């Protein structure tokens, strides 16, 4: 009973724009490595940090761009929050 490795829900953080962004660019999914598509907007934030972020409160997040499943640092920061 297998499912595609690209079908798992992915953790995100919302911002002041109209679209949330991915927390990192990869995660385990259905026994394999779910890598988001190259060029996906992401935050350079580890899942373990995201797990314990206080909901609702605004943080400053490091912006990035996915390449080969890694959120590459864009040396820019923006307001982010857990909870859409």
């Amino acid at each position: 009973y297998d499912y595609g490795t690209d079908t798992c829900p992915f953790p995100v953080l919302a911002n002041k724009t109209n679209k949330a962004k991915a927390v990192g660019c990869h995660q385990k999914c259905n026994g394999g490595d779910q890598k988001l598509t190259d060029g996906t907007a992401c935050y350079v934030v580890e899942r373990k940090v995201w797990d314990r972020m206080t909901p609702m409160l605004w943080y400053e997040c490091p912006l990035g761009e996915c390449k080969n499943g890694v959120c590459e640092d864009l040396r820019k920061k923006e307001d982010c929050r857990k909870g859409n």
């Binding site: 595609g4 079908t7 798992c8 992915f10 995100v12 919302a14 679209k19 996906t40 859409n84």
Partner: protein
């Protein structure tokens, strides 16, 4: 409670015997509206709200919740 998004959909129907519950992604902050099915072994699977089987499966799950038999 809305802290995930679906980036792709499954491209095959899930037999309803495998399905336990579902949640809808309606937030415009996600790339697309989605349905997340939770299976009987706690897998979370993103699915297209526009496919009949997805809509039929939500209907069937809602009917079970509404008419349990002791």
């Amino acid at each position: 409670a809305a802290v995930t998004c679906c980036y792709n959909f499954t491209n095959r129907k899930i037999s309803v015997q495998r399905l336990a519950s579902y949640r809808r992604i309606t937030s415009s902050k996600c790339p697309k509206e989605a349905v997340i099915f939770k299976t009987i072994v706690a897998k979370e699977i993103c699915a297209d709200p526009k496919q009949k089987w997805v809509q039929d499966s939500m209907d069937h799950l809602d009917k079970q919740t509404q008419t349990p038999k002791t």
